[PDB]
Amino acid sequence: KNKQYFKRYQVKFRRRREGKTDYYARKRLTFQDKNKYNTPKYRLIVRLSNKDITVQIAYARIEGDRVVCAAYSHELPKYGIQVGLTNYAAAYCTGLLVARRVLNKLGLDSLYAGCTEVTGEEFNVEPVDDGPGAFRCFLDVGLARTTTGARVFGAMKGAVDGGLNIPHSVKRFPGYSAETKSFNADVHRAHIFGQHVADYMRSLEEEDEESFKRQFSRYIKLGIRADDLEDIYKKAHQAIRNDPTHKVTAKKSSAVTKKRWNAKKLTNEQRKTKIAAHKAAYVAKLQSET
């Protein structure tokens, strides 16, 4: 069926086809008050893959969206994190990364030091006086569900503990028991230091050798026992507090026209002659029988 059904059809746009935005959150995310004219709203972007979790800082303009700051879990190999790139422990240091990377951009490395000794502290940073108004930040959850315990809040957690400025509430944290808080504030000390994962190595330390052949694999390949995980984080965090390397790369370059590579599109001379290569075959298949 459905011949003319294509004619009156129209679409939802491009990112709805590939499932990238929603257009319902982002519009009422970036609904800037018009009294302020083009002061940017400066939201924070966190997206995730099966192997990587990402952290971006961007804002809208008229033509589009400039993304001033970026992050990956790919940088964490420089900070002693080899595996486990989709942990809530790993979620902390990623938000911690850009939390001082912007402070190198605007020079606010001294002020807004943030929560230093993290053991699960609900520390909204205070707006300081007599000088720099603090750079506010807003949170997007993208397309994932903002249930109590999503890992996207862990990217917020290192961001809010690094000195960034968010209207931030606490009811959607993992470990805060929804019936009823009772803020067990030390549960993030088990989250950020990976103890919620580190017990699962220890609670499978003696039960199955095949458990290590299963998930939390490659920890055995590097001798990562279930004891020393938090200090890898703590040494990374001060090194995060030392300096983010700001992704300097100077290969420069092996990129251009390699090799062609994507099938340049067969213009009018090679279209109709390909038809002419195909038209003369069909009369030849009839000229064969007579």
């Binding site: 195909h278 069909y282 009369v283 009839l286 029988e289 007579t290």
Partner: protein, 217 residues
């Protein structure tokens, strides 16, 4: 109430509908819009001829039926029953605008001096632009003297001045007669009931190729 014929010589009331909103519409009895051998192919009737008028003349529904019957009886008495394809090309969707005057018998005794003046339907009529082809015959070439000399007695039921065209098309198709021949000869005109197929090249391949197959084999 089957008002006399002089009252609708001019399309000056509104282009009316026939709705799914107003119930009460009577019957247009024109249940046939074409006569002759409708089972004929295109090759049976090469000749074509219409009958046309020269105004914005409003045409009543009734002489369409006379236009059916009157040329029918001549053509069944002259040149065989099935040797043509009569077509009256026109549907009377337009309605006329009536208050019925059955205000008699005394027991009712108010309705209308002219308060108010709504309408009721009693019949239909047809709206004709200039050069709008109405009554047409698709036959063979040997009956040009049969149809037009029967078409006299249908022109004197459709009012006013009417001219007579002899087509140069090949029957009721949308193709000229000399144009009809050369593109038919290979594949490009594929035969159907009353018409043909315009350009089977697009597409994309196999419909051209299936038409390529049966003309060779």
């Amino acid at each position: 109430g089957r008002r006399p014929a002089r009252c609708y010589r001019y399309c000056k009331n509104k282009p009316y509908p026939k709705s799914r909103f107003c119930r009460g519409v009577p019957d247009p009895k024109i249940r046939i819009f074409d006569l002759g051998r409708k089972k004929a192919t295109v090759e049976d009737f090469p000749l074509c001829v219409h009958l046309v008028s020269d105004e914005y003349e409003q045409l009543s529904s009734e002489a369409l039926e006379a236009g059916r019957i009157c040329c029918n009886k001549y053509l069944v008495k002259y040149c065989g029953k099935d040797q043509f394809h009569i077509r009256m090309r026109l549907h009377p969707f337009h309605v006329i605008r009536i208050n019925k005057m059955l205000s008699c018998a005394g027991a009712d005794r108010l309705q209308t001096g002219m308060r108010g003046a709504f309408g009721k339907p009693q019949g239909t009529v047809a709206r004709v632009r200039i050069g709008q082809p109405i009554m047409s015959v698709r036959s063979s070439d040997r009956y040009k003297a049969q149809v037009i000399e029967a078409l006299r007695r249908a022109k004197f039921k459709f009012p006013g001045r009417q001219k007579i065209y002899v087509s140069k098309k090949w029957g009721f198709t949308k193709y000229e007669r000399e144009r009809y021949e050369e593109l038919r000869d290979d594949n490009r005109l594929e035969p159907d009931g009353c018409n043909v197929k315009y350009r089977p090249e697009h597409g994309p391949i196999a419909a051209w190729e299936k038409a390529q197959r049966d003309v060779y084999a």
